[PDB]
Amino acid sequence: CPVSSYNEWDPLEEVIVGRAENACVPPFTIEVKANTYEKYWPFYQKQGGHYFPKDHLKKAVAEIEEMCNILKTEGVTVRRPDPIDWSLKYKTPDFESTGLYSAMPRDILIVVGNEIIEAPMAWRSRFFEYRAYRSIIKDYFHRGAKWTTAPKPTMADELYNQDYPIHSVEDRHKLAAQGKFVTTEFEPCFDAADFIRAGRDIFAQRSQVTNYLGIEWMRRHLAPDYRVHIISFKDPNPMHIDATFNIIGPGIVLSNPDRPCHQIDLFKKAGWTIITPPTPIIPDDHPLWMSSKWLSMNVLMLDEKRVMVDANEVPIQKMFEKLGITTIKVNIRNANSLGGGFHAWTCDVRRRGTLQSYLD
Amino acid sequence: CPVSSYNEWDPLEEVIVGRAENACVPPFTIEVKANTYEKYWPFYQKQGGHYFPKDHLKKAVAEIEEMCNILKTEGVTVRRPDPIDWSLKYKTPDFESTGLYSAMPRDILIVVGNEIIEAPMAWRSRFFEYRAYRSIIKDYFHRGAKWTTAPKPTMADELYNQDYPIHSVEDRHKLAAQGKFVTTEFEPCFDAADFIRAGRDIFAQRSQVTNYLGIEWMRRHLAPDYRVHIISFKDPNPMHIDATFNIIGPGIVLSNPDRPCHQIDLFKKAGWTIITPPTPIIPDDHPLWMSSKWLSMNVLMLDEKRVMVDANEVPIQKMFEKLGITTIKVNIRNANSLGGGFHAWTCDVRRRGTLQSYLD
Ligand SMILES: NC(=[NH2+])NCCC[C@H](N)C(=O)O
Numbered sequence A, B: 001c002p003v004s005s006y007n008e009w010d011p012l013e014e015v016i017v018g019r020a021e022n023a024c025v026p027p028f029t030i031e032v033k034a035n036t037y038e039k040y041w042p043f044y045q046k047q048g049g050h051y052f053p054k055d056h057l058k059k060a061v062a063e064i065e066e067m068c069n070i071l072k073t074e075g076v077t078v079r080r081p082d083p084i085d086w087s088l089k090y091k092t093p094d095f096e097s098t099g100l101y102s103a104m105p106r107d108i109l110i111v112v113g114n115e116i117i118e119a120p121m122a123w124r125s126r127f128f129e130y131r132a133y134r135s136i137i138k139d140y141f142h143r144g145a146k147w148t149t150a151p152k153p154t155m156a157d158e159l160y161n162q163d164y165p166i167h168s169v170e171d172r173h174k175l176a177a178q179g180k181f182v183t184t185e186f187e188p189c190f191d192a193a194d195f196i197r198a199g200r201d202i203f204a205q206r207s208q209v210t211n212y213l214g215i216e217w218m219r220r221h222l223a224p225d226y227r228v229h230i231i232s233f234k235d236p237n238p239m240h241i242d243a244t245f246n247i248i249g250p251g252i253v254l255s256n257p258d259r260p261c262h263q264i265d266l267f268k269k270a271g272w273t274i275i276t277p278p279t280p281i282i283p284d285d286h287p288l289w290m291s292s293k294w295l296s297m298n299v300l301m302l303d304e305k306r307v308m309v310d311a312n313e314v315p316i317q318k319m320f321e322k323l324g325i326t327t328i329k330v331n332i333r334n335a336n337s338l339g340g341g342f343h344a345w346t347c348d349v350r351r352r353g354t355l356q357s358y359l360d
């Protein structure tokens, strides 16, 4: 079976890497506004529905081709989504929208064992994102993998908190503490990236795009073999867990200094090593439209002792080096603008290893 | 758990019954043309996209309200889809269309144990049909049921045989013999009604709307607990199996005289009773837009000795009576026009019983 991955560190053999092509600025709706930094609001207000800066996309394409070259050298089979125009306007009975991109496979696909799971998504601009990956998924299906598509939400207004403290309010930390974000509990919804795998245990975070209904759906779908746990952090704008609590080895995790975990004791007690990375060195003047600066810790492990880290982040490189971890430096400064690091731009289809417990 | 049904005959306790409201004539595309009798082509060519005759829909609504009254008297909890306007035009990146109806729950939902499964569908006009049932499904989910949505196809041209012997060709029997219909094997697709449950064994038929990919998806999704078997019949236009091979009891099945099963020996050898019903008596002048006359055998079992049969079909009533089966006569002559009998207008959510084997 081509599909087989139980965690984030076993020897990588096959991966899907996203595309920067035809990426489009999402329409500036409630859920998009909730994610965007004040700094970029004008960009969104004017660019919404049109392609992200073509000059920038050309550089991102270049950067990702090089990253694929390197993965190939490291002995990894690379698959890529199909090219699609994300500017096509679609209309369901509940809403109308233009698309985003197929840059982040991690956002939409998660592999648990020999099964590929397509997350429902929570953003209107990402409703039909799965279309880019069907050619790859049908092939794995023909070859034996299990294929599951979690329930696709209606994404009706009812799913969003029309009156969320968007604009700037920060007490959104208070709602955050109450497990309350821009998505309601109207229907299940989640991005695959809010889940991070550690064998028989999977950790999930209730974020702006992943609700309790979505988490419960996964937990209930993977039981009894896998245990899905919920963990939270200090963060007024959570979306995906891989730039907050990135698990890089059996009992080793990278915890974002700015986003501490309320349940860190579960891990200290289990005898896990909690490493806090150094601060990103990316200039404040570089466009990070969909994200924070912490993409530096969004690393991808080729195996336990090999990490693909950003060429520009020397401090985090040094940290891995003192730990005895071989750093493979790839530069993706421009691809970073679309919202992800290596963990986000990929989806590990097959790693060599077995289903085990590490919290045990 | 509200959801619990392993076969078609155990004591019925809860059911979803469809709605005739706002039903719309589907656009006359390849897959629709393949299903429609020459007789109704003008009706489709002119009515496509508009509501089915309002005068007729009013009678169907009346008939179904009475059927719900009766189910209530028989001690069955009745749930109904939410009212929706099926005339709304939607547009995915692959196609554009108007809707059909939420009259046939059997077409889209199937319950295996404590799990509700939403079929992907194969008709463009039925892409968003699931929207009518989400309120009911979320409630069962909150109450403990498992909820699965099979992969939703793109329904791109590639899924359909643009040059299928539609118009009238009959050698479509030859393709039929080759397992070839109007849907290709491009991506998985199926209507839930092509599957019929008998405990640990489920029988499926490759039809115009259910391909081998769709069958394989189910088989692979329900293994190891349930065995999905494929069976075929003499039929140049298969769609749903419940008016062809309707299983009404442990080891008892109604086989359509005109649609014999190529694998009938599996059943004779298992010691099953194969009953062939009498011919329908519905007048040839009554509009049967979406179906054949055989809706008469599309019965619904309240339990092993109680069947809900059409008030007008005396001959089939007599047959059940000689068998010691109590007939509950409900008239749905007009609802028949939308395409189904009792088995089609409903979906059994809960029946009292256990998972057993009957082929054993
Ligand atoms: N899979 C992903 N797209 N991960 C990116 C995480 C970025 C995170 N929301 C941040 O701003 O730090």
Ligand SMILES: NC(=[NH2+])NCCC[C@H](N)C(=O)O
Residues within 6 Å of the ligand: B104, B106, B107, B193, B238, B239, B240, B241, B242, B243, B290, B291, B292, B293, B294, B295, B298, B339, B340, B341, B343, B344
């Ligand atoms: N679940 C259903 N809609 N069943 C109806 C089956 C009708 C069948 N295609 C016929 O013409 O005999």
